[PDB]
Amino acid sequence: MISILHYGYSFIMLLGALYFYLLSKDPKGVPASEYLIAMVIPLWSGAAYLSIALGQGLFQYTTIYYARYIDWVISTPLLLAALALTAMFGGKKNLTLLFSLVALDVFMIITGFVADLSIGTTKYIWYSLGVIALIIILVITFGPLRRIALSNGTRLARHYTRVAIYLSALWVCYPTAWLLGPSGLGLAQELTEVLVFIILPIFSKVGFSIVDLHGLRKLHQ
Amino acid sequence: MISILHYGYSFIMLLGALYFYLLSKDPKGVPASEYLIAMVIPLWSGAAYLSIALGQGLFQYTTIYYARYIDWVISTPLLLAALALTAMFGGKKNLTLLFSLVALDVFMIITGFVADLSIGTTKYIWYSLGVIALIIILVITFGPLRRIALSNGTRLARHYTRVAIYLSALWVCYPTAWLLGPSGLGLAQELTEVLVFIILPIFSKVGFSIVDLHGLRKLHQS
Amino acid sequence: MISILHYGYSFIMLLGALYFYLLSKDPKGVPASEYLIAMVIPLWSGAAYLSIALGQGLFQYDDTTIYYARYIDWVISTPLLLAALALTAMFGGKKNLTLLFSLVALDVFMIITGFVADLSIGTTKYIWYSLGVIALIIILVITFGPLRRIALSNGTRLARHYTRVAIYLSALWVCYPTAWLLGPSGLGLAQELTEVLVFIILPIFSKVGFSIVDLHGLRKLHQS
Ligand SMILES: CCCCCCCC/C=C/CCCCCCCC(=O)OC[C@H](O)CO
Ligand SMILES: CCCCCCCC/C=C/CCCCCCCC(=O)O
Ligand SMILES: CCCCCCCC/C=C/CCCCCCCC(=O)O
Ligand code: NA
Ligand code: NA
Ligand code: NA
């Protein structure tokens, strides 16, 4: 079942990527960069999850699905880039703020991998550092990055706020599931965690970009 | 023999690098970025192949020359950057298209490495995904990237087209040799593959940049 | 003792990061990019050294202990330090990102050769070490040659500050391959504990000290 779920995931990622490609051909004032980011996220995630489907992207240690970290270390910084460029749409870019989010995010995913390879107090030190990185990402998202969105007018700021809440709601689920599941306290069963880390990312990767791109395209007319 | 061939390769990479450095000192209207890229490619490849020469960049699994993938994951994106900047010479840059090629290319090399670590059907799934990435790179090369080159005038577009054909002809040999050799069907012997992955990259890395830089330098007024 | 020294280091990195964050809030004409670089360096190093303190960022190999977390640190922190140095030289003028990325490429290569040298035995070890030393020499040639000429093109006051920071960095950086060669990774003349203290104290000056001096000099160029 776990294999088939991962094949299904990879197929949905492929369909999302093709959809973003088709949108890219009639862009409606959205720059090519935002379509490229929207395509890379699902294609990379699809490849990583394909490796799990084939029985390759995991080892016994508990089962570490290390292919999830290979996925997230690329897909999650690109999602924050997508979010930052939404805030900056129609105005001057702040690439310093964007790379701040990328750095916090890459650190966050690495702490998750290290936490998974750790035992006891050490595991929760790494987990805690990752949670602190996420909190700072959310502070940037609803603080300075939202103020950039407000500077780009009512309609953009409304769209940004919707996508920021969408992303934030989904992202806080990941460390929650991780702590509850086999990598953490072991309250939730492996199969439950597998379904959560199939369904969440479908919304985090394809859903997010459908909402993000549709809202930006609508600003054209 | 395999060790000595890799020492030879690394020496040729060093000579290429020094040649590009000397050209960089009298640049003839070619930006410093294109000289930097031309130098990094052979120096990085030379270091990776030095590790094989020293008996370090390989393990038994059949022999996986993993240092080739360490080489290509850096050298091949830089070659496509060189190709993209050639198309954009004298005009506005399209870094979105450039990073599209980089992303496709890094994926391509990773699928190769995973294919090498895989057995049976799994191996050919990864190989096929890599080949699909290469096809998209070639579609971009002869489609949108070539239209950028045409927008920069007859002489630039003529040079771009020659370099694009040069690169494309060499690059399709890599997945061909891979499939024929020990990582794939195992029709070609290890030593045969070693010579192919010595001679191809000499043309792919030093040859390519000699041709690319010479054509760009020739566009120079005064 | 080794564990406690690493906890201490990580705490000092955290304090440096906080100081640079506070400076960033009253920037005095220094772009946000230079404050971000100044913060990432110590935070990343602090994380890497935290892993050593927890007993994780090290393994036994050739009977010696390889502190592999040091290379994970340096491969990110050292290119960012040269970026900080290059942006100092370019302060008030046109950026040369080609020269900046030249330093980044040399530097990443340098750290990788160090790691490979540490995993190597005999002549092979010293081939890798030598390639890293050649990379450092070229970095220092760029630092005092073309990069210094960019700094001089940005006027007396900037060039004076650049030269001070270039000497500061260069003096500290030549110590790393010197300690490496003397210590357990090289000739084994210096003891593990001695090397540990050197690779605690040097980086405190290389990462926090450097950026205090660098940022203070740039901030002082500001009028208000
Ligand atoms: C194993 C492989 C590891 C790979 C290692 C990766 C190295 C990470 C650092 C990169 C250099 C950072 C470069 C900084 C970019 C230039 C900044 C710039 O342009 O600044 C503009 C201005 O200052 C704003 O106002
Ligand atoms: C593990 C794989 C990591 C791959 C990293 C990528 C390798 C480095 C190549 C980057 C592409 C270079 C792009 C240069 C842009 C030049 C644009 C300009 O000159 O304005
Ligand atoms: C592992 C070693 C390789 C690491 C990356 C090396 C980067 C090589 C390519 C960089 C090209 C950057 C050129 C930027 C051009 C901008 C124009 C300028 O200001 O000079
Ligand atoms: Na966006
Ligand atoms: Na070129
Ligand atoms: Na600086």
Write the DSSP assignment of C13-71 as a string of letters. Answer: HHHHHHHHHHHHHS-TT--HHHHHHHHHHHHHHHHHHHHHHTT-S-EEETTEEE-THHH
Q: Whose CA is nearest to atom 18 of ligand 1?
A: C33
Pocket of ligand 3 (CB under 6 A): B 33, 36-37, 40, 44, 74; C 95-98, 101, 104-105, 108-109
CA pair distance B167, B75, nearest whole angstrom: 13
User: Contact B108/B170 with Cβ under 8 angstroms?
Assistant: no
How far off is chain B from A57, nearest CA to CA, in Å?
10
Q: Is A159 exposed, middle or buried (0-12, 13-18, 19+ CB in 10 A)?
A: buried
Residues of A in contact with C32 (CB under 8 A): 94, 96-97
**Nearest CA distance, C32 vs chain A (angstrom):** 6
Q: Which 3 state secondary structure label does DSSP give B212?
A: helix
CA–CA separation, A128 vs B198, rounded Å?
48
Looking at this protein, which amino acid is placed at residue B84?
A
Q: Which of B31, B36, B44 sits opposite C102 (nearest CB)?
A: B36
Q: Would you state the structure tokens that stand for residue C174, as one six-digit string?
A: 């030549």
Q: Which residue does chain C place closest to B74, by CA atoms?
A: C105
* Residues in a beta bridge with C193: none
| Chain A CB within 8 Å of residue C152 CB | no
Q: In terms of residues, how long is chain A?
A: 221
Ligand 1: residue of C37, C95, C96, C139 to mutate (most ligand atoms within 8 A of CB) is C95
Name the phi and psi angles at A63, rounded to 5.
-95, 115
- What are the chain A neighbours of C56 within 8 Å (beta carbons)? 114, 118, 122
**Residues 71-100 of chain C whose Cβ lies under 8 A from any Cβ of chain A:** none
Q: Per the structure block, which two tokens stand in for C115?
A: 């790691």
Residue listed under structure tokens 């010197």: C178
User: What is the Cβ-side half-sphere exposure of residue B12, based on CA atoms within 13 angstroms?
Assistant: 18
Distance CA A74, CA A105 (A): 10
* Alpha-carbon span A208 to A202, nearest angstrom: 9
Would you say the C-alpha torsion B27, B32, B38, B42 has a positive or negative sign?
positive
**With breaks defined as C to next N over 2.5 Å, after which residues does chain B break?**
61
Helix A95-117 to helix A154-180 angle (10° resolution) is 10
Enumerate the residues of chain B whose CB falls inside 8 A of the CB of residue C127. Answer: 50, 54
User: What three-state secondary structure class fits A64?
Assistant: strand
**What residue in A sits closest to C41 (Cα-Cα)?**
A103
Q: Does A54 touch chain B (CB under 8 A)?
A: yes
**Is the Cβ pair A36, B103 closer than 8 Å?**
yes
Residues in Cβ contact with A34 at an 8 Å cutoff, skipping those fewer than 6 apart = A82, A85, A212, A213, A216
Report the Cα–Cα distance between both ends of chain A, in Å, rounded: 45
Q: Is residue B2 within 8 Å of B194, Cβ to Cβ?
A: yes
Disruptive mutation site among B61, B96, B110 for chain A (greatest number of A CBs within 10 Å): B96
Residue C62 burial (CB count, 10 A)? 13
Cα A76 to Cα A128, A133, A169, B54: the distances in Å are 18, 13, 14, 38
Contact B208, B37 (CB under 8 A): no
CB contact at 8 A, B13 and B51: no
Question: Which technique was used to obtain these atomic coordinates?
Answer: X-ray
Judge: C96–B47 Cβ closer than 8 Å, yes or no.
no
Task: Kindly state the DSSP code that residue B143 receives in the 8-state scheme.
Answer: T
Instruction: Name which of C211, C210, C208, C198 is nearest C67 in CA terms.
Output: C198
**Which ligand ends up closest to the CA of B45?**
3
| Cβ(A205)–Cβ(A16) below 8 Å | yes
Q: In whole angstroms, what is the distance from residue C153 CA to residue C169 CA?
A: 21
The residue to which tokens 């440096």 are assigned = C16
CB contact set of B40 (below 8 Å; sequence gap of 6+): B74, B75, B78, C105
How far apart, in whole angstroms, are the C-alpha atoms of residue C90 and residue C83?
10
Closest in A43, A44, A56 to B122, CB measured? A56
Helix boundaries (H) for chain A: 2-25, 32-53, 67-87, 95-117, 121-142, 144-150, 154-180, 190-201, 208-218
Q: Which residues contact C203 (CB under 8 A, 6 or more apart)?
A: C9, C45, C73, C77
Q: Are C78 and C115 in contact (CB under 8 A)?
A: no
Tokens found for residue A91: 């105005």
Query: Which residues touch C73 (CB under 8 Å, ≥6 apart)?
Result: C44, C45, C48, C49, C203
A100, C47: Cβ pair inside 8 Å? no
> Ligand 3 centroid vs B40 CA: distance in angstroms?
9
3-state class (DSSP) for residue B41 = helix
Q: Hey, is A31 helix, strand or coil?
A: coil
Instruction: Choose which residue among B71, B74, B105, B107 to substitute to test ligand 2 binding: the one with the highest number of ligand atoms within 8 A of its C-beta.
Output: B74
Burial pattern C157-166, b for ≥16 Cβ within 10 A else e, equals: ebbebbbebb
Strands B59-60 and B63-64: antiparallel
Kindly give the distance from the C-alpha atom of residue A106 to the centroid of ligand 4, in angstroms, as a whole number.
19
Atom number, ligand 1, closest to the C-alpha of residue C34:
23
C98–B33 C-beta distance less than 8 A: yes
Task: Please tell me the residue having the least CA distance from ligand 1 atom 23.
Answer: C33
Largest CA distance in chain A: 55
Which helix (H) or strand (E) is C134 found in, with range? helix C123-144
Atom of ligand 3 nearest to the CA of C95: 19
For residue B112, the chain A residues in CB contact (below 8 A) are: none
CA pair distance A109, A126, nearest whole angstrom = 10
B24 touches A at CB < 8 Å: no
Q: Measuring CA to CA, which residue among B105, B80, B116 is closest to residue B193?
A: B116
User: Could you give the CA distance from residue A124 to residue A130 in angstroms, rounded to a whole number?
Assistant: 10
Backbone angles phi, psi at C94, to 5 degrees: -65, 140
The neighbourhood of ligand 5, an ion, using CB within 5 A, equals B 34, 82, 85-86, 212
Q: Please state at what angle helix A95-117 crosses helix A67-87, rounded to 10 degrees.
A: 160
Residues 6+ apart with CB under 8 A from B144: B97
- Alpha-carbon span B149 to C104, nearest angstrom: 30
Pairing of strands A63-64, B59-60: unpaired
CA C13 to CA C208: how far, in whole Å? 7
Q: What are phi and psi of C59, to 5 degrees?
A: -145, 160
Nearest to A134 by CA among A157, A156, A105, A154: A105
| Run of H or E including B64 | strand B63-64
* C52 alpha carbon, distance to own chain's centre: 18
Q: Categorise residue A89: left if φ over 0, alpha if ψ from -120 to 50, beta otherwise.
A: beta
Q: Which chains touch A (3 or more CB pairs under 8 A)?
A: B, C
* Beta-carbon-side half-sphere exposure of residue C106 (alpha carbons within 13 Å): 21
A9 touches A49 (CB < 8 A): yes
CA C150 to CA C143: how far, in whole Å? 10
Q: How far apart are CA C12 and CA C206, in angstroms?
A: 13
Q: Which of C51, C73, C76 to mutate to test the interface with A (most CBs of A within 10 A)?
A: C51
Name the residue facing B36 among C101, C109, C131 (closest C-beta). C101
Residue B171's alpha-carbon distances to B39, B78, C62, C182, in angstroms, are: 20, 14, 40, 45
User: Under a CB-based contact definition with an 8 Å cutoff, are residues A162 and A124 in contact?
Assistant: no
CA distances from B13 to A5, B43, B53, B82 (A): 47, 6, 14, 17
Residues 6+ apart with CB under 8 A from C195: C179, C182, C183, C184, C185
Planar angle of CA A183, A185, A188, nearest 5 degrees: 80
Residues 6+ apart with CB under 8 A from A191: A1, A2
Measure in Å the smallest separation between the Cα of B50 and chain C Cα atoms.
10
Task: Give the distance from residue C102's alpha carbon to the nearest chain B alpha carbon, in angstroms.
Answer: 7
DSSP category for residue A152: T
Q: Which of C70, C87, C102 to probe ligand 1 with, by most ligand atoms within 8 A of CB?
A: C87
